[PDB]
Amino acid sequence: PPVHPFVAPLSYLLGTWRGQGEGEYPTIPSFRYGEEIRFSHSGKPVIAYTQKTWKLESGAPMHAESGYFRPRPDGSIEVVIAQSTGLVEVQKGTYNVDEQSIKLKSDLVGNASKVKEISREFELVDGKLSYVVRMSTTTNPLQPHLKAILDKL
């Protein structure tokens, strides 16, 4: 089906992306990971999102998550994600056409033992998809947990 007019401003996302990231937090040792993301659609005002990650040295599967991006013509967007670890998140924010960026902060984090808020910020930089994920916990304020850069395949 054709791309819905609400999805068209984010059409740069559509496809498969692969790259690598670094994870961190004051409470844990830093680590690296490989990541692959697919964004797809079915003609609705919604983009399907799927992630998988792995250990670089072994290819051993790590975290996965999936969900839906719902952009609107006023530049607002909501994103819902379920994670393999048993969390859900509702993200709300805005996208910027000139910057090809998306800025989100959680309205809800469900089924967490420790996490309170999550923010996710994406930007296309020289055609590569970059993001930073920040989180707050019961013992730590909102700060980075993940950063990755992915090439479009």
Place this chain on the structure above:
Amino acid sequence: PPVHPFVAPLSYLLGTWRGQGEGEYPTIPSFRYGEEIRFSHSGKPVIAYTQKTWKLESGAPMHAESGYFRPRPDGSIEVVIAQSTGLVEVQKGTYNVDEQSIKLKSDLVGNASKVKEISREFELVDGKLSYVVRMSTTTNPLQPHLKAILDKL
């Protein structure tokens, strides 16, 4: 990777399923839909779930959702789902090995305008996957919205 021992009791789910369902609610006219579900895994104690639905007469895409099933050896299970419509849900309940059934009720429904609780009940019947989804709204008590039966492909 091999099936994780926590996933093995639900190994009957793994694969792709296709069939059809009927949707209803006191507030809406009844409708029919086609559905396809995939259950997969990556060696973790987690089963990935993806759904798509369509109009039977046209093949036109309808609802999609995705998430993760997390069974444990005591017979408990939690399921997290994100829906294309912008909802998230945390489901908790139990599975029964002798019946090949799974019974879930929501601990949380996020980003809903109307829905309060959702329950989902699955059973394998003569090798086919059957489910009933019930929901409560601001104006209606917990009752069926969806029922479907799918054949394993």
